[PDB]
Design a protein around this ligand. Structure first.
Ligand SMILES: *[C@@H]1O[C@H](CO)[C@@H](O[C@@H]2O[C@H](CO)[C@@H](O)[C@H](O)[C@H]2NC(C)=O)[C@H](O)[C@H]1NC(C)=O
Ligand SMILES: *[C@@H]1O[C@H](CO)[C@@H](O[C@@H]2O[C@H](CO)[C@@H](O)[C@H](O)[C@H]2NC(C)=O)[C@H](O)[C@H]1NC(C)=O
Ligand SMILES: *[C@@H]1O[C@H](CO)[C@@H](O)[C@H](O)[C@H]1NC(C)=O
Ligand SMILES: *[C@@H]1O[C@H](CO)[C@@H](O)[C@H](O)[C@H]1NC(C)=O
Lengths: 224, 105, 224, 224, 224, 105
């Protein structure tokens, strides 16, 4: 008997604006006519749990329970309880998931770096790098927007938050968007919007273009 | 890059065919003034029809074949130049397609 | 049972070169046989009103009375009262109207601002700002002149005097003129003129063109 | 005999992260023994109000009722009605409150303007303008951030959405921040942030510093 | 018997804001207890005629009659009449003065010129010249304001409007302000405000400084 | 041009004597920062008292002897430099009189 409860993640909440939680039931046989429901701390009821996951062909059972709620209830400290009943396990099953209170909050620092000159010389492809460092806890959502329209999510790769080597409790993450050099050389502007639950508006945007960082060459000083 | 080299007649109307791209909301049919290296927006999705073209042009977008069509009603000698169409906030840094117009009378 | 009057404003005085005394009736059911006259502190009557108004469709009646007199008496503070006679009221109502005599006077400061660079990239339009600050009382008049000929008032917008946070008593106002990027890049000097009582001739003009902040001593051109 | 309510505004929602339903009574003589409750289209009641208000000193009474609910239902358009019971009225009054469902949406365009040269000559102060244009509906929120920390709202002024003459339906607004000529000439980048429903993340930031329109490629210095 | 009536001049009206007209009685003996009064077209009365001119020691009599009126009455076409009674001439005397209707109106053109280089080389004094040309009729009021405060009227000299040599009906005038060279070389700004009853706001201002008109010397063109 | 070379003591108050000119409405007691060639207005008739001097200085004008007097209450090491006083909108192009200040403690 193994039933998994997945608390909502900030990345998913910001991505879908439709906060959801899942009670995944596994380690059981493929039996139909199951009963799954989500209940609050005081034992109330929730909406219907539609879109039940299909059974797996490897002699495993999958079921999901979705409870539509609003973020203030989840983040106010209220605790949820999942109800699972089955013929194999007639005893009711209860699981508790909530926010892990008791952690300090810090704001990330975003640094956007241009492609390497040697990479540009190949006159083939270019990679812009976004470095998010110093944020705690580990729940950062990174997205790339070219001209106000987000690029296909399959164009960039983001890294899981690995602990900062010198700073205990704080973390860092990476994000690489590979663009064609021709586009980058035409002045196309790219920005790295990052969402964290410690930022003032929980949103922050840093941009980069071919002219960003280039130094001054001529220092004309005409004297009379 | 591509040139429709669209042709027409004095009076009547002529349709300009330009590609409708995605991830670009502002769509315009700029006129290449080619005076001091500046292009003036004739029409846009932001709703700006030049005074000289007021009440004579329209822009309809429909992503069926990834095409947006712009129609110019009536015709004048002035209507015989280049109308580069493109997208994006910067009008001079778009001009995805170039086209030419003339008059047969 | 009220009769509200409209004293002449400095904006109207400077716009028409004619101060007028006007009063309207309200909270009275529509009727007829009503005569409105204007009287002064001295006691003698003045010119007869014309242009009878109509009946408000919300079960209320209003009568308008015009009287043209010298602005000097209005400034001097002469007491002007319009007398209206109705049937329901047995005694005609009196409405005294006078200018507040004694206000700290401060001349307004004007600042014209050229359109932003990012706005002059869509090659569609441009907005020029005339900014008036530091003036008491709150009677100011702003209009825009192009090439010595005033523009139509249907292409610029002016705000109402909002109190200044720093200096109490002082007010500020803003006027925006929407022109074309073409016109602005083809010279065309634009002038905003401000009329206030504390001004010496009650007139103040400033102009800005495309070339205003240039050194006008050298001319550097980067060509590739 | 009226009861006027205050529906939650987008500015309040974005400022407090809490949508609230509130209604007040008017045109009623001051009395007691009045209970106010909030109801919804579904029919069930909601949380109880608190913080009873006082009696208006103009022979009128007002009762305030607070009810915190999910913003999703307010956006969805749920019908919310507050019921107030009084002595003079035999039947309690009902006040239905709902959001207008269906409005053309257009993202606002922001433009920051640097202080005028003639203003930076008294060496006293400077005024920076954040200019928002092209947005429907008229629910916009503007605030100023310095060095990643928001400033106090008692040092900038924001106007009300005034309709655009050119584009009907579109509106415009203006925000002015008064800083010191010293601070402005000592770097200090200033950021104006605008929140609107049509915006992708409902957030938009722009910055201007003393050195923003420079070519950054050459540097001409006239010395005598 | 010679009695002079002086209609108000636009220069005096703009200078004093207290429009006045004078009925000067001369060619009589120094006799006291005279009676002088001003009357309108319909025979009404005016205010008291205070400040009677003193008799002259050269066997001539001087008397002035002042009638305080407002400008719209004078400029609306209404005609005035002066009443003079004396023992030597018991017969009443009447004089009619009004605006000379039937003349075209044109706006002046103002050109402000800097001092001559040769005059500056003397390193002593400098003279700024204001040239007002092309105005009809001949009623122009010229004033000089350094920093918003008018300079002493004894510092500059203005010329009477002489007919334009090539343009019939139009006139021109001059005005010379002599300033110390030291002041002019320190960037002191001077302006020439001219008032005419054909200008849009009846006011116009043109300014001049040491840097006004100086041409560009350096044309740097750096190429890569 | 003239220098009062006014002197004072720590604490208490010191009065700065500067000429009150005519045909000039704005009267200021600018402090010569002498950093990047810029002078910051300490006080003015337009009503602007620097934050560091808020509630400690005042400006009274009376054309009796063509003089306006400015009093500085309290005193700090910071209050030991040049305070050129002048008139006109441009603060750096006025500075009619120059003065120096110090502290004796
Ligand atoms: C200084 O040089 C610049 C660059 O050559 C001049 O800018 C040109 O001005 C003309 C009109 O006078 C325009 O037709 C060109 O388009 C401008 N050049 C560019 C690149 O836009 C400028 O006019 C010169 N200054 C003066 C006072 O003549
Ligand atoms: C380009 O040259 C100018 C003139 O030398 C530099 O302006 C100076 O900047 C420093 C601070 O960096 C100030 O202390 C000076 O007051 C400035 N000079 C003047 C006349 O105000 C400018 O900084 C240079 N550009 C860069 C990028 O260094
Ligand atoms: C640039 O020119 C200025 C003015 O001549 C000078 O002060 C500065 O040192 C120069 N920059 C460098 C890096 O030498
Ligand atoms: C100034 O320089 C520009 C750019 O090199 C050039 O086009 C122009 O002719 C020059 N001016 C004169 C008067 O030669």
């Amino acid at each position: 008997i193994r039933v998994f409860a997945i608390p909502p993640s900030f990345a998913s909440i910001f991505l879908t604006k439709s906060t959801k939680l899942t009670c995944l039931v596994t380690d059981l046989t493929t039996y139909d006519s199951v009963t799954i429901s989500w209940t609050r701390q005081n034992g109330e009821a929730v909406k219907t749990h539609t879109n039940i996951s299909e059974s797996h062909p490897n002699a495993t059972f999958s079921a999901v329970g979705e409870a539509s709620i609003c973020e203030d209830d989840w983040n106010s400290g209220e605790r949820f309880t999942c109800t699972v009943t089955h013929t194999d396990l007639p005893s009711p099953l209860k699981q508790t998931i909530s926010r892990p209170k008791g952690v300090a909050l810090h704001r990330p620092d975003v640094y956007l770096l241009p492609p390497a000159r040697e990479q540009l010389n190949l006159r083939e492809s270019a990679t812009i790098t976004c470095l998010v460092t110093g944020f705690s806890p580990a729940d950062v959502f990174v997205q790339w927007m070219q001209r106000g329209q987000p690029l296909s999510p399959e164009k960039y790769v983001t890294s899981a938050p690995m602990p900062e080597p010198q700073a205990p409790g704080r973390y860092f993450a990476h994000s690489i968007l590979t663009v064609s050099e021709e586009e980058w050389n035409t002045g196309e502007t790219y920005t790295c919007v990052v969402a964290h639950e410690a930022l003032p508006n929980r949103v922050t945007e840093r941009t980069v273009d071919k002219s960003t960082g280039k130094p001054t060459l001529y220092n004309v000083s005409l004297v009379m | 890059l591509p040139e429709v080299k669209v042709e027409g007649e004095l009076g009547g109307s002529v349709t300009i065919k330009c590609p409708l791209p995605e991830m670009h909301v502002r769509i315009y049919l700029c006129r290449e003034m080619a005076g001091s290296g500046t292009c003036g927006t004739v029409v846009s999705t932001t709703n700006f029809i030049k005074a000289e073209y007021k009440g004579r042009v329209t822009l309809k977008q429909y992503p069926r074949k990834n095409l947006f069509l712009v129609e110019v009603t009536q015709l004048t000698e002035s209507d015989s130049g280049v109308y580069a169409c493109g997208a994006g906030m910067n009008t001079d840094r778009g001009k995805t397609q170039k086209v030419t117009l003339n008059v047969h009378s």
